[PDB]
């Protein structure tokens, strides 16, 4: 496709006409809403599983724009918008009138004054044109700091996952920068990336020949094999290449 993801704030995640940012600074809900408002935005509104399927891979619990009305007994978004069904599973965790988002489109009821991390979201249209455009990416790919990503939840072995990324004129995840790919901290589970062990040399290298940069990943031996699953907090778990797993493509460097 090769389309520029539309007006977003600088170094926000831009996905399907929606800007996003994850704040790992734990504030309470109110503080978190104000924090998003101070960036001309608001807390995460979840309106569609399809347009916001990026949210399926998120680690941990994050304040979401959803609020409970004591009188109604209904859940509404910060701006008053109704919570559409077949989006969220509301779970009674704590007594409270706010909800933490967590993956598999779940929503844990939490006390609003409990510090938690948070997600701001704003639509591309409501950001003015004098603003940051995320670099050329395919249509339905997650654009973050000009790199393009997509997560394939249909699990395949390493080789097929490579070919899968090849078929979309991409390659498997190549980590080259903790700063530029700090998004990867919030990925849950593990996923095939393009890091391959050469058993002869005993080395690790990327799909395109590049050698693994030091102090970029922690490598843990899990399953003997010549392929590495990315896992969160920049880890690279060694896995048998024939083991089917989910995977992450990226437009190449």
């Amino acid at each position: 496709t090769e389309s520029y993801c539309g007006p977003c704030p600088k170094n926000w995640i831009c996905y399907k006409n929606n800007c996003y940012q994850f704040f790992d600074e734990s504030k309470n809900w109110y503080e978190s809403q104000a924090s998003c408002m101070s960036q001309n935005a608001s807390l995460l509104k979840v309106y569609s599983k399809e347009d916001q399927d990026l949210l399926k891979l998120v680690k941990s619990y994050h304040w979401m724009g959803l609020v409970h009305i004591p009188t109604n007994g209904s859940w509404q978004w910060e701006d008053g918008s109704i919570l559409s069904p077949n989006l969220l599973t509301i779970i009674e965790m704590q007594k409270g009138d706010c909800a933490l988002y967590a993956s598999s489109f779940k929503g844990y009821i939490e006390n609003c004054s409990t510090p938690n991390t948070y997600i701001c979201m704003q639509r591309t249209v409501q950001i003015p044109l004098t603003e940051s455009y995320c670099g050329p990416c395919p249509k339905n790919w997650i654009c973050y700091k000009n790199n393009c990503y997509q997560f394939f939840d249909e699990s395949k072995n390493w080789y097929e996952s490579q070919a899968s990324c090849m078929s979309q004129n991409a390659s498997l995840l190549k980590v080259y920068s903790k700063e530029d790919q700090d998004l990867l901290k919030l990925v849950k589970s593990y996923h095939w990336m393009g890091l391959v062990h050469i058993p002869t040399n005993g080395s690790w290298q990327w799909e395109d020949g590049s050698i693994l940069s030091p102090n970029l990943l922690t490598i843990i031996e899990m399953q003997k094999g010549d392929c590495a699953l990315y896992a969160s907090s920049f880890k690279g778990y060694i896995e048998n290449c024939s083991t089917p797993n989910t995977y992450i493509c990226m437009q190449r460097t």
């Binding site: 941990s60 844990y108 880890k235």
Partner: protein, 163 residues
Amino acid sequence: EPHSLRYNLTVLSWDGSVQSGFLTEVHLDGQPFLRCDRQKCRANKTWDRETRDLTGWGKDLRMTLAHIKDQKEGLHSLQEIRVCEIHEDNSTRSSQHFYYDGELFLSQNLETLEWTMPQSSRAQTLAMNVRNFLKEDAMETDTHYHAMRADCLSELRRYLKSG
């Protein structure tokens, strides 16, 4: 009127290599309810929620087992039990228990988030690895364990709601 849901997920390592997949036993009021693995779940019976969630847990527990710096000698199993109870008076109990080669070595009460550590220093080593892993690598927090209790209870409710 008192009910319980008991998940029991096992992951295995052979010569220190953590095996692919996992095996989960679910018990509903102590009656065997599901046996799940990587492929599917088995008791229009659809278990897409279970398969998703247990697979994710399988993945986590495999990470956890991989982080145990024990020995690469033979078979080892890491087994996590998650229990939640709804008592007659509507109160709950809930807990998390890890067995390594069938020896209980770590428990957390999910109502109180207090861990009970085992007596033997070996078992304690295992417990400390895993606790390290959970806190540092998995970055698990009180919220996660609140949520774990809630998940379990939500599922127990859900199952009670149908039959």
